[PDB]
């Protein structure tokens, strides 16, 4: 029940939770929960479930939680809007790419592997092997979504395009964005054409 | 969040009542509003959160001279909703003037339901283009909502009128209503009665109870469009996140619809992708390429083969696309809806921004221009004459739809980097 | 062949050729590999080794020639 | 690859519709196009790769004044194909002029089907020589395809006309159409109605429904000619690899056909080889030796005894052959086709380049020259007169067929090392 609640009431419901803070403080989080950097979360696991679910496992969950919140940050900042006409090209030119990156992270990894993972944890017959099959999902889901791999040759573009969702939100110049954007975009496409396999979903787009 | 639904006109009240019957049968809902013993899912999109979960629909019915409203009355689904939001000619001028004289109390009905709601996110208008009492009244009242509430979204469900022209002012009515759809609405979904009748004569040999069958079709359309909201999905749980991908230009908000099972009396996702890529699964009738295509699917799928399906459909290059810009086909998936009979388990629905609709607009333009040059098909309404002595509102709408046709054709060009 | 670039390319082109008709999925055992590129042509293939010792590395190289 | 089939004239539309019924019954195909529960094989030669495998035939029907097209209409096999490629006198001049006036929209039908196709490899014309509406129109339109698409292959299925001469301009019609077959076509298969009627009176006592029976015969011919493509074989899966072995000279593309079982109401391959080497299994009526002979076989064979069969037929020296050059008899084998009743399990079909057809050409030459010297059998068509005031197109065709007869007779000579 906790494993199902983990991936469904965080990592939606938490989207609105994030959007209220988008437009702060440590006590605001609690009243919003009970109703792009930082953000702790605190919760306790009972001891018969704490000798299976580790304390360090929370530190693993925090890493992926942060990154998904940054994706929702850039996504929601661009989900408030619908040369002078060059801005509309910069709308299509970017909305594409952020939907492709979002589609990649959500569908290709977090919905394939998680649906297989529930079907796999029901095939654990004991306490100890349940820890092992869990950890052999943790250390690879921590790798598949980029948190340790190609951190400054693929990941840095994902970092730099998050601020474009802010700069383009303010204006609601234009050519000076697409000249940079198409260059880093082409670096990324010409690296990802050799790709581990799940990067080819956005190598084409 | 909370969206208030508007039903008006004979046609709009028909598909609205049918769709509310659809959602009553769909979720665990009694005909009285009582939560049933098989009801979980997200139930606050149109459903009033009552104590015993009397999920009262946010359904505002406003018309005058009630005929079909009596047929709505003798039904147990008049006990599903009634927060007293139900309110008791066929021309644009007559409906416009009738909406003018009683705008205040029906707008008070709107305001009462608005503050009674927890929030407001969209106006969903159940309508048909030149729907008789709906036309004129709806364009006027739509201007009242857009002036009065500029922070909300407008989606207008309507069908393209095909009654084989009899009212001769119908291109004028549709032209003025289409002007209001351009400037007072942010999304307009129109469907061809011709192509729907073609599909009805295709799958079966029935075309005579066309009203009843078309209620089933657009009720499937609207339930499928809101299924990701009303059942717990992941994205497009806001209307605006759904609308944003379709629109690069806020005057090009007219979308083509298609539905993958044409018979109901399953297989993999690549197959339905190839099916929906055919124009015979489309419910709507030079070179025209889509601006952006997005599909919703509901059924029994393989969660890895959807990647493989997009991969093969891409490398097939089974489509064209538009010169100016990186868009894509967009996949979206949700649950197959429980508590109803589930036949032909995969049902897909597509929203696409296509330039082919500019030809349909030009057909109505040519009809309006022909009747305008002849000038014997306005019938000299006195309400129209005192409303507009020179009838230059129709000239201004024709200018608007011509600007849209120009935007369509320059968007067909690669020079939509420049102005359209 | 530069033998770092073409190896990906032959298999990409091969599966895309197969997608036009006839086995758009089911049986991924043949994959064009590379070791002119016609005179450096290889292939990757797999059989169930405990359940097929009739096919060995020797038998399949004989087929490959 | 993808070959688009052309049916035109009364006779050509007859055997085309019969052959499409043959391929619908042959593969696992419903009369609606639906893949059946016994359908694998190669299904993209004429079959549109639809999603649910609606293998829609690439069948373009174009004529004027439809009579037999109505008989095609009242049938479930009008639901097999219709991508809207079906389109609604008996002289060369009348058909020529009628093809001239509507060439543009039917060529637009051609172009729409061409870009709708994945590729284009050949034009298969379902025809008969002087087929009434087919003549004139077909020669004109064939010139339009050959001018418009010079990178494709032309195979023309037609029969030699024998109606016991009544149209008296028929040698003129066949002469001009034969000119177009020489210069705008790369392969022409003609068959004698006399010899086919002789075989029909030979095997049975029926000669009266000759149209229906001859549809069965040429449908067996064409299915056997394409069986190596439509079922997974090894070679001549291109048309061009099949055509290349037959032709040493691109004006000598006229082939003789024979079929080894003459009754249908088995044994070894040497026996059918000896049978097909007899001229009474041939469907077509000085010294004449073949240029090159190739045979297709389908049935239950011994895969080593085919070597032994060629060995014994060679060392028998049961044939002559031509002085100039190393050719051979050529064997080709494919599967016996499933999903049909299989009676007389070995069915063989032969394509041979023979000089005996020059005598048949000379018969038509003598007929044309006789009617030309008499000059009372053109009937003075005004379309023919304004098309050609001097009627020297017929003189030029007679020059062409005379050059071909000279090439035939010098190819009979060992001096086809020199010019023919």
Swiss-Prot record, chain A:
Job of this protein: Component of the gamma-tubulin ring complex (gTuRC) which mediates microtubule nucleation. The gTuRC regulates the minus-end nucleation of alpha-beta tubulin heterodimers that grow into microtubule protafilaments, a critical step in centrosome duplication and spindle formation.
Subcellular location: Cytoplasm, Cytoskeleton, Microtubule organizing center, Centrosome
Tissue expression profile of the protein: Widely expressed, with highest levels in heart and skeletal muscle and moderate levels in brain.
Coiled-coil region(s): none
Superkingdom of source: Eukaryota
Organism: Homo sapiens (Human)
Name of the protein: Gamma-tubulin complex component 5
Region of the whole protein represented: 718 to 1016 of 1024
Family membership: Belongs to the TUBGCP family.
Curated annotation (Swiss-Prot), chains B, D:
Protein source organism: Homo sapiens
The protein's name in its UniProt record: Tubulin gamma-1 chain
A Pfam family hit: Tubulin_C
Family, as annotated: Belongs to the tubulin family.
Cited InterPro entries: Gamma_tubulin, Tub_FtsZ_C, Tubulin, Tubulin/FtsZ-like_C, Tubulin/FtsZ_2-layer-sand-dom, Tubulin/FtsZ_GTPase_sf, Tubulin_C, Tubulin_CS
Subcellular location: Cytoplasm, Cytoskeleton, Microtubule organizing center, Centrosome; Cytoplasm, Cytoskeleton, Spindle
Subunit structure: Component of the gamma-tubulin ring complex (gTuRC) consisting of TUBGCP2, TUBGCP3, TUBGCP4, TUBGCP5 and TUBGCP6 and gamma-tubulin TUBG1 or TUBG2. TUBGCP2, TUBGCP3, TUBGCP4, TUBGCP5 and TUBGCP6 assemble in a 5:5:2:1:1 stoichiometry; each is associated with a gamma-tubulin, thereby arranging 14 gamma-tubulins in a helical manner. Gamma-tubulin at the first position is blocked by TUBGCP3 at the last position, allowing 13 protafilaments to grow into a microtubule.
Modified-residue entries (Phosphoserine), positions: 119
UniProtKB/Swiss-Prot annotation, chain C:
Superkingdom of the organism of origin: Eukaryota
Residues annotated as signal peptide: none
Protein name: Gamma-tubulin complex component 4
Disease tied to this protein: Microcephaly and chorioretinopathy, autosomal recessive, 3: A disorder characterized by congenital microcephaly and chorioretinal dysplasia associated with poor vision and nystagmus. Variable ocular anomalies include microphthalmia, retinal folding, retinal detachment, optic nerve hypoplasia, absence of retinal vessels, round areas of chorioretinal atrophy, and attenuated electroretinogram. Most patients have mild developmental delay and mild learning difficulties.
Residue range from the parent sequence: 383 to 477 of 667
Tissue specificity comment: Ubiquitously expressed.
Gene name of this polypeptide: TUBGCP4
Homology family: Belongs to the TUBGCP family.
Assembly and oligomerization: Component of the gamma-tubulin ring complex (gTuRC) consisting of TUBGCP2, TUBGCP3, TUBGCP4, TUBGCP5 and TUBGCP6 and gamma-tubulin TUBG1 or TUBG2. TUBGCP2, TUBGCP3, TUBGCP4, TUBGCP5 and TUBGCP6 assemble in a 5:5:2:1:1 stoichiometry; each is associated with a gamma-tubulin, thereby arranging 14 gamma-tubulins in a helical manner. Gamma-tubulin at the first position is blocked by TUBGCP3 at the last position, allowing 13 protafilaments to grow into a microtubule.
Localization per Swiss-Prot or TrEMBL: Cytoplasm, Cytoskeleton, Microtubule organizing center, Centrosome
Native organism: Homo sapiens (Human)
Role according to the record: Component of the gamma-tubulin ring complex (gTuRC) which mediates microtubule nucleation. The gTuRC regulates the minus-end nucleation of alpha-beta tubulin heterodimers that grow into microtubule protafilaments, a critical step in centrosome duplication and spindle formation.
């Amino acid at each position: 029940e906790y494993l199902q609640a983990m991936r469904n009431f965080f990592l939606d419901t938490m989207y609105d939770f994030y959007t209220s803070i988008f437009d702060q403080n440590v006590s605001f989080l609690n009243v919003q929960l009970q109703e792009l950097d930082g953000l702790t979360l605190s919760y306790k696991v009972p001891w018969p479930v704490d000798i299976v679910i580790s304390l360090e496992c929370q530190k693993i969950y925090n890493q992926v939680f942060l990154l998904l919140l940054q994706i929702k940050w850039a996504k929601y900042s661009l989900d408030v809007l619908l040369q002078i006409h060059r801005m509309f090209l910069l709308r299509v030119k970017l909305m594409h790419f952020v939907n492709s990156l979002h589609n990649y992270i959500m569908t290709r990894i977090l919905h394939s592997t998680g649906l297989e993972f529930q079907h796999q944890v029901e095939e654990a017959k004991d306490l100890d092997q349940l820890i092992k099959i869990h950890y052999r999902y943790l250390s690879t889901i921590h790798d598949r979504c980029l948190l340790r791999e190609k951190v400054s040759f693929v990941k840095e573009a994902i970092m730099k395009v998050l601020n474009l969702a802010l700069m383009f939100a303010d204006g609601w110049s234009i050519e000076k964005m697409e000249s940079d954007f198409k260059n880093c975009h082409m670096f990324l496409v010409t690296i990802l054409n050799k790709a581990f396999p799940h990067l080819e979903s956005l190598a084409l787009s | 969040r909370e969206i208030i639904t508007l039903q008006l006109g004979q046609c709009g009240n028909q598909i609205g009542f049918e769709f509310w019957k659809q959602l009553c049968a769909e979720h665990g809902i009694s005909p009285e509003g009582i939560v049933e013993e098989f009801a979980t899912d997200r139930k606050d999109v149109f459903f009033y959160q009552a104590d015993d979960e009397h999920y009262i629909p946010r359904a505002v019915l406003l018309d005058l001279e009630p005929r079909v409203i009596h047929s709505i009355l003798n039904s147990p689904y008049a006990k599903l909703y009634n927060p007293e939001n139900i309110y008791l000619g066929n021309n644009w001028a007559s409906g416009f003037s009738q909406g003018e004289k009683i705008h205040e109390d029906i707008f008070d009905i709107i305001d009462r339901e608005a503050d009674g709601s927890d929030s407001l996110e969209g106006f969903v208008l159940c309508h048909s283009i030149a729907g008789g009492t709906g036309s004129g009244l709806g364009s006027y009242l739509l201007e009242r909502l857009n002036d009065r509430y500029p922070k909300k979204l407008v989606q207008t469900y309507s069908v393209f009128p095909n009654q084989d022209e009899d009212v001769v002012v119908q291109p004028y009515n549709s032209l003025l209503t289409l002007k209001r759809l351009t400037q007072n609405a942010d999304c307009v979904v129109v469907l061809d009665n011709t192509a729907l009748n073609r599909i009805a004569t295709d799958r079966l040999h029935i075309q005579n109870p066309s009203f009843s069958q078309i209620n089933q079709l657009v009720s499937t359309i609207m339930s499928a469009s809101t299924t990701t909201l009303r059942y717990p999905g992941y994205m497009n749980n806001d209307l605006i996140g759904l609308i944003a991908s379709l629109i690069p230009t806020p005057r090009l908000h007219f979308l083509m619809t298609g539905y993958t099972p044409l018979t109901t009396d399953k297989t993999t996702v690549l197959d339905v992708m190839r099916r929906l890529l055919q124009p015979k699964n489309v419910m709507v009738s030079t070179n025209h390429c889509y601006i952006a295509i997005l599909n919703i699917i509901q059924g029994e799928v393989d969660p890895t083969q959807v990647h493989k399906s997009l991969q093969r459909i891409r490398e097939r290059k089974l489509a064209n696309f538009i010169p100016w810009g990186p868009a894509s086909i967009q996949v979206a998936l949700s649950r197959k809806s429980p508590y109803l009979p589930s036949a032909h388990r995969v049902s897909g629905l597509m929203m696409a921004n296509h330039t082919s609709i500019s030809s349909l607009f030009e057909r109505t333009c040519r009809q309006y221009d022909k009747l305008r040059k002849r000038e014997a098909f306005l019938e000299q309404f006195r309400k129209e004459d005192m409303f507009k002595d020179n009838f230059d509102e129709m000239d201004t709408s024709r200018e608007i739809v011509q600007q849209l046709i120009d935007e369509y054709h320059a968007a067909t060009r690669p020079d939509y980097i420049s102005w359209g | 062949p530069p033998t770092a670039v073409t190896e990906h390319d032959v298999n990409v082109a091969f599966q895309q050729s197969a997608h036009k008709v006839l086995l758009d999925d089911d049986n991924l055992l043949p994959l064009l590999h590379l070791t002119s590129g016609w005179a450096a042509l290889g292939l990757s293939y797999k059989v169930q080794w405990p359940l097929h010792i009739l096919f060995t590395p020797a038998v399949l190289e004989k087929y490959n020639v």
